Structure formats: structure tokens, C-alpha cells
């Protein structure tokens, strides 16, 4: 499999992938824009604080009908939400990226996330029952997740 | 607003008004200004201001605050005001203000009995309520589908 953004040098770079994992695409995109470009220890502390709701994740693009929070003013934005499950899956992907840095034998402290990406996946269909005896589909929207991490100097 | 002059000492209640988080703040508001009052070269630049203030201004407003130590509230922040002095000429108004800097002003010194005196405040809070409780409009009768 390939990756968008072939990195600057694969010697100092490690990478990770997630294929067909049951999350929401929109929540994972809005939390990936929160993570992207931050150091890895700050990102791990951040995604441990998201699941305990001490610090939030801003919503920027998919901002429809999302209520306000006080914690959003760190990001210069007015709308925030605390996705548990997206933060858990992205924490697991960061742990896999940590283990791949361990296998390639790098400086485990000074990684940053140079590139991250989330895109939609082939969705699965259930169905509901709406009035006058009608059927309407009820479909998920899982995502594929790429991340490319690079050593800071 | 021409220029503002504050007094030689500023109490902790006013400093707590200037700050937001007194627990976090290092109290550093108004130290260099009091040092300007203290030193002699500061006074020369300071006494030049009251010479200019007599010359141009129509209105002099005096900044004061409440003593929160006497009150049984929990707030402990002094509220600041502007109080326009409606006395005579600007010279004696400014002499009155510099004569009474850092003094207490009792209520009996300004108001008097039987004086018809207006009140300005902020009303009660009743929250985001509806039309019939806001504008005192009339209820629709019982038979109305979707709301009365």
C-alpha cells in the first residue's frame, strides 16, 4: 500500500495505517486537525485528556448543530465536542506508530506528527422502519487512517 | 478623555478590580506608577499634568471605589465609577479633587434628606422566557393545536 505525501526521508520517518475501523469520519477528521503538527507526548496527554473531558477538540468544518463549550477558546474557535471513540482509536494508532519507531530503532522522544490523513471507507448498510410501512437505509461511515511521523531536530 | 491621574497609593480592592485571577496574579499592577509619585523627577512630570488639566478641560470626573471589607458580601472586588463634579470653575474643582484624594466620602456629605434622587441599576434576571411572559401578550384559547 502507498501513502499520500511521500516524506522527506524514510530513514528518520516512521508510519502507521488503519483500515476499516468503526468510527465516525467527521469526528475523526475534526480530531485529526486537532492533532496534526503537534509533538507526540503532547498528543498523548491530549488524547488522554479528551476521554476525561478536561480538554476539548474543536470542530471547524463539520460544524452543523454542534453546541458550544468553554474549553474551545484554546483553539480560537467557539464550538467543541469530546469524541471518546475517535480519540481511543487514534490513541491506539499512535501506540502502533510508537511500536514501529521502536522496531526501526529511532529516538523515541522527539517524534512529531508531520502528516496525518483520514478518508472515507466502503460503508455498511442496515435498515430502519419509518412510517407508512417504509424502509430507509441506515448506513455507517468508517474511515481509513494514515499517519507519517518524523523526528524533530 | 484627556489623561488619567491616579493617587499615590492604590488599595488591594482596586488592584483586585484591575486583575481577573488574584490567586494567579503577581500583584504587579501599579508599582512603577507609585514609584513615579515617589521620586522627585517623576513629580516634575506629574505636576505638569495638573497644570495642563486646569487649562483645557470642561468636565472633571473623579474615580472612586467601595470598601468591600465592611460589607457582608463575598465579592471583595471594589467597583469603580466616574463621578462628575458639577461645582464651579475647573480650577477649584481640581483643587477640591487633589485636596480630597485618598480620603473617604460619606453619603451625608453629598446627599441630603428629602432630596428627590434617581436610581440607576440592573434589573432582575428571569432568563430566556417566552412571549406571554416577556411582552404581556394575550393567551390563545384552549382549542389551539400546537401551543397556547
Amino acid at each position: 500500500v502507498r501513502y499520500s505525501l511521500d516524506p522527506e526521508n524514510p530513514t528518520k520517518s516512521c508510519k502507521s495505517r488503519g483500515s476499516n475501523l468503526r468510527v465516525h469520519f467527521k469526528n475523526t477528521r475534526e480530531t485529526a486537525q486537532a492533532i496534526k503538527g503537534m509533538h507526540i507526548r503532547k498528543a498523548t496527554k491530549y488524547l488522554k485528556d479528551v476521554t476525561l473531558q478536561k480538554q476539548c477538540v474543536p470542530f471547524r468544518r463539520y460544524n452543523g448543530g454542534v453546541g458550544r463549550c468553554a474549553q474551545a477558546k484554546q483553539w480560537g474557535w467557539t464550538q467543541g465536542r469530546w469524541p471518546k471513540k475517535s480519540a481511543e482509536f487514534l490513541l491506539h494508532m499512535l501506540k502502533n506508530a510508537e511500536s514501529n519507531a521502536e522496531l526501526k530503532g529511532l529516538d523515541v522522544d522527539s517524534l512529531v506528527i508531520e502528516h496525518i490523513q483520514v478518508n472515507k471507507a466502503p460503508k455498511m448498510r442496515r435498515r430502519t422502519y419509518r412510517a407508512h410501512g417504509r424502509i430507509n437505509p441506515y448506513m455507517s461511515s468508517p474511515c481509513h487512517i494514515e499517519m507519517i511521523l518524523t523526528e524533530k531536530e | 478623555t484627556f489623561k488619567t491621574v491616579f493617587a499615590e497609593h492604590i488599595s488591594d480592592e482596586c488592584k483586585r478590580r484591575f486583575y481577573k485571577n488574584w490567586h494567579k496574579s503577581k500583584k504587579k499592577a501599579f508599582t512603577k506608577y507609585c514609584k513615579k509619585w515617589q521620586d522627585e523627577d517623576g513629580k516634575k512630570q506629574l505636576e505638569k499634568d495638573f497644570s495642563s488639566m486646569k487649562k483645557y478641560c470642561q468636565v472633571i470626573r473623579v474615580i472612586a471605589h467601595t470598601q468591600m471589607r465592611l460589607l457582608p458580601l463575598r465579592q471583595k472586588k471594589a467597583h469603580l465609577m466616574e463621578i462628575q463634579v458639577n461645582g464651579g470653575t475647573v480650577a477649584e474643582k481640581l483643587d477640591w479633587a487633589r485636596e480630597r484624594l485618598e480620603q473617604q466620602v460619606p453619603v451625608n456629605q453629598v446627599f441630603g434628606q428629602d432630596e428627590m434622587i434617581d436610581v440607576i441599576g440592573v434589573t432582575k434576571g428571569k432568563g430566556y422566557k417566552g412571549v406571554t411572559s416577556r411582552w404581556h401578550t394575550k393567551k390563545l384559547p384552549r382549542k389551539t393545536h400546537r401551543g397556547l
Binding site: - | 468636565v59 473623579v62 471605589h65 467601595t66 460589607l71 458580601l73 467597583h79 465609577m81 466616574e82 463621578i83 462628575q84 463634579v85 458639577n86 461645582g87 464651579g88 470653575t89 477649584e92 474643582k93 477640591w96 466620602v105 453619603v107 453629598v110 446627599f111 440607576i120 441599576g121 440592573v122 416577556r134 411582552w135 404581556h136 401578550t137
Partner: protein, 50 residues
């Protein structure tokens, strides 16, 4: 059209921008006009409703 029973209109339109105030200490919109004849005095106070 021609409502057939004219009512005094509810509320006042003069107070229309109904709004939480920008300040909870009630500021003074205007102080009364001075004269040079009177001796020097003040015109305001703070108070606490009990």
C-alpha cells in the same frame, strides 16, 4: 385590515434592544449640567440593595 377593535400596542418600542447589559454595574448615561454658581459637590454613589 382595519382590525375592527383598536388595541393599545403591547410593550414599548423605545426599549426594543432587549439585551443582557455589557456591564452589570449600572453606568451613568449622563450627569446633570453644572453651573459655576453652586459650590463644589459630587453627583453619584455606589450602593448595595439589601
Amino acid at each position: 385590515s382595519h382590525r375592527k377593535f383598536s388595541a393599545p400596542r403591547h410593550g414599548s418600542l423605545g426599549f426594543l434592544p432587549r439585551k443582557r447589559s455589557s456591564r452589570h454595574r449600572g453606568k451613568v448615561k449622563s450627569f446633570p449640567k453644572d453651573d459655576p454658581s453652586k459650590p463644589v459637590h459630587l453627583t453619584a454613589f455606589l450602593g448595595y440593595k439589601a
